[PDB]
Design a protein around this nucleic acid. Structure first.
Lengths: 41, 534, 51
DNA sequence: GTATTCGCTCTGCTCCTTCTCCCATCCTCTCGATATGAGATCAACTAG
RNA sequence: AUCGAGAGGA
DNA sequence: CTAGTTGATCTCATATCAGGAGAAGGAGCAGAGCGAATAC
């Protein structure tokens, strides 16, 4: 449930943020959402 | 001479000898020959189906219908025990057929391949065994056979056996089967037989099963939803009319008035398990082996064999007045004691049947422990000495009980001098037990014959009998009438690893189950909507 | 090519249960499906079922 | 009659994608999981 | 006994 | 010669994310080069 922004040197994204969202009561496993940045109109 | 519509001059001096149903069968066979299709002479035993075949082939040869000037080379695949009979039949009805047997006994005294070549070169009548079809399946099928007659064609009942493949490797349009019962266990056998006679009529076996076999059996249970039974009835009707013009089957109901038939009574005795036998059976049905069977980790078949052994006699499964096979330790042997004593006091003559040869030997040892004279014939006896024993039993009265398994000997070995028959243990096939009872009660039986089936109530044997009746019901529904009162439950019929022996307070499972006892486009549309509402 | 028994030994176990080798089990699989496929291609079988 | 194009082919050049391979040596220990008979055929007798 | 896993040693 | 007994063998039948690196293929574009094809 925390947004983490990393940058992979060898990838098609300059920057990719992710959150492994998970409802507090363990109804389900954590579902991950990624919001990326396409590499370098 | 009798003449048919297109011209098929069956000779008068043969045609006059046939009976009305036999002449109808010759007519039907020749209709097939005009349509260039095969069929099943599914008439039950004793009516005479070889006479029809020789009469039809003789008419086809004399009539010179034509390819081939008259009848060409034909192959007859029959069990060994009847091969010589066949040639004699030809030689007494139609001599000029050069009939020849392919066998080690034979008469050729040279290479058998030369016999096939010579017989085909003379358009002869060649008789084989099923084994020779299987072994020379590549050699025997090169000489353009004009007819193939599988006498007792229920050897083809399995669509997997190498005999089935070797027999279906023939090329002629003309395939006739002479079987007393086209199907014996389930519809696999009907499909195999129809794949033989007419390769394309019934569909591929998957299609056939998924359309016919599963719906019919699902509608053969009394707990079926109404839609299921109605679909089963409709599908049975479709299979019936699809097979109508190619299975000629006649019972002993319409032809009974022509030949005599002494009355036959039959009882099913329910023989309680002895307390030691009951304890052994309960230990086996509580032991971890049947639990692993229910888990599917082990083959259920061994458990079936074990429980059948237990119900026969504990000494089979377990392994003075305490020697091997003492008759006091199994209730069925108690009832055999009583029946044998009473029947010997009555002066009658007994057939003693059992599927197991080991328990057959146990029964022999028991009979030796008694003073009954007896004679044994089983699979261990040489075939060349089988005919004497039967004759010696049939001619005199100084032999009391004759010992069989249900499946030894040729089909319907003539055991006529017997009066009473007891089936010691049921089998899975209804047809083998029906053949067991039929063997004593045949044409030319002088006295009323009664069959006593020995069952142990609440055991595996009762379920074997239930399965036997269920298969018989399926065969009857397919072959004589689809509408049928439903007897059984799906779960009770199939679960067969329990022990509920009756205490005489409540009735037995069988009696509880059997407690009651051009088209003008409007006829065409009417029939379509009629079949579809069901 | 089925290999011999030494390539796929059936090792005996503390009791009598003879454990077969992975190759033997796999040859069991190949044999069963080969026999089953053989009976289908010999008989009438759907082209997609044969496939 | 030669310009001039011009359509069409023939590579060929980067590049992106797939895929397949590899990832020190040796040694010790513990611990968990992992049928049965009848009938037919044939061949050796086993004697007549 | 085989397989896998783990913990260790140099 | 010649039938009867003895073993082996086969069939059949009975239920119920924190790799990486390199080589091989295919893709699309780019142009070169030559045949035909209008056309001055």
């Amino acid at each position: 449930n925390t947004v983490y922004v990393f940058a992979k040197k060898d990838s098609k994204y300059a920057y990719t943020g992710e959150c492994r969202s998970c409802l507090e009561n363990s109804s389900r496993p954590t579902s991950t959402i990624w919001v990326s940045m396409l590499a370098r109109a | 001479d009798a003449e048919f519509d297109e011209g098929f001059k069956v000779p008068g001096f043969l045609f006059k000898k046939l009976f009305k149903y036999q002449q109808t069968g010759v007519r039907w066979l020749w209709e097939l020959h005009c349509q260039q299709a095969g069929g099943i002479l599914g008439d039950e035993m004793g009516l005479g189906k070889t006479i029809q075949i020789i009469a039809f082939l003789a008419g086809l040869s004399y009539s010179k219908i034509r390819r081939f000037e008259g009848l060409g080379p034909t192959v007859i695949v029959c069990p060994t025990t009847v091969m010589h009979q066949w040639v004699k039949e030809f030689h007494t009805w139609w001599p000029p057929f050069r009939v020849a047997i392919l066998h080690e006994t034979g008469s050729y005294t040279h290479k058998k391949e030369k016999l096939i070549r010579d017989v085909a070169h003379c358009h002869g009548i060649l008789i084989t065994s099923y084994s020779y079809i299987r072994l020379m399946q590549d050699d025997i099928s090169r000489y353009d056979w004009h007819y193939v007659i599988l006498d007792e064609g229920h050897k083809i009942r399995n669509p997997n056996a190498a005999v089935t493949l070797a027999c279906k490797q023939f090329r002629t349009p003309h395939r006739i089967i002479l079987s007393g019962s086209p199907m014996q266990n389930n519809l696999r056998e009907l499909w195999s037989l129809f794949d033989f006679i007419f390769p394309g009529k019934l569909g591929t076996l998957p299609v056939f099963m998924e359309q016919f076999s599963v719906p019919i059996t699902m509608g053969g249970y009394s707990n079926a939803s109404p839609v299921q039974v109605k679909t089963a009835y409709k599908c049975a009707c479709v299979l019936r009319d699809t097979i109508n013009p190619y299975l000629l089957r006649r019972m002993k109901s319409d032809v009974k008035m022509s030949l005599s038939l002494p009355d036959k009574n039959e009882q099913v005795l329910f023989c309680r398990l002895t307390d030691e036998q009951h304890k052994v059976y309960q230990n086996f049905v509580d032991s971890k082996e049947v639990y692993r069977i229910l888990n599917g980790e082990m083959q259920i078949f061994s458990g079936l064999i074990a429980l059948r052994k237990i119900c026969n006699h504990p000494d089979l499964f377990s392994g003075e007045e305490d020697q091997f096979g003492y008759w006091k330790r199994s209730g069925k042997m108690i009832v055999v004691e009583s029946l044998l004593k009473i029947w010997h006091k009555q002066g009658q003559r007994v057939l003693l049947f059992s599927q197991s040869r080991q328990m057959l030997d146990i029964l022999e040892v028991f009979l030796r422990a008694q003073k009954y004279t007896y004679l044994k014939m089983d699979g261990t006896t040489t075939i060349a000495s089988r005919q004497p024993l039967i004759t010696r039993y049939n001619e005199d009265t100084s032999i009391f009980v004759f010992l069989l398994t249900t499946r030894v000997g040729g089909l319907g070995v003539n055991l006529t001098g017997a009066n009473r028959v007891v089936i010691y243990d049921p089998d899975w096939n209804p047809s083998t037990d029906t053949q067991a009872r039929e063997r004593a009660w045949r044409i030319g039986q002088k006295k009323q014959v009664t069959v006593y089936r020995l069952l142990t109530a609440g055991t595996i044997e009762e379920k074997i009998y239930h399965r036997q009746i269920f298969k018989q019901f399926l065969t009857n529904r397919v072959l004589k009438d689809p509408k049928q009162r439903r007897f059984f439950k799906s779960n009770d019929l199939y679960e067969l690893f329990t022990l509920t022996s009756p205490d005489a307070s409540q009735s037995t499972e069988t009696s509880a189950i059997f407690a009651g006892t051009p088209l003008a486009s409007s006829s065409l549309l009417a029939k379509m909507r009629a079949r579809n509402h069901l | 090519p089925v290999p011999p028994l030494s390539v796929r030994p059936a090792v005996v176990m503390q009791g009598s249960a003879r454990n077969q080798d992975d190759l033997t089990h796999k040859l069991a699989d190949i044999v069963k499906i080969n026999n089953q496929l053989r009976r289908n291609e010999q008989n009438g079988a759907a082209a997609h079922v044969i496939a």
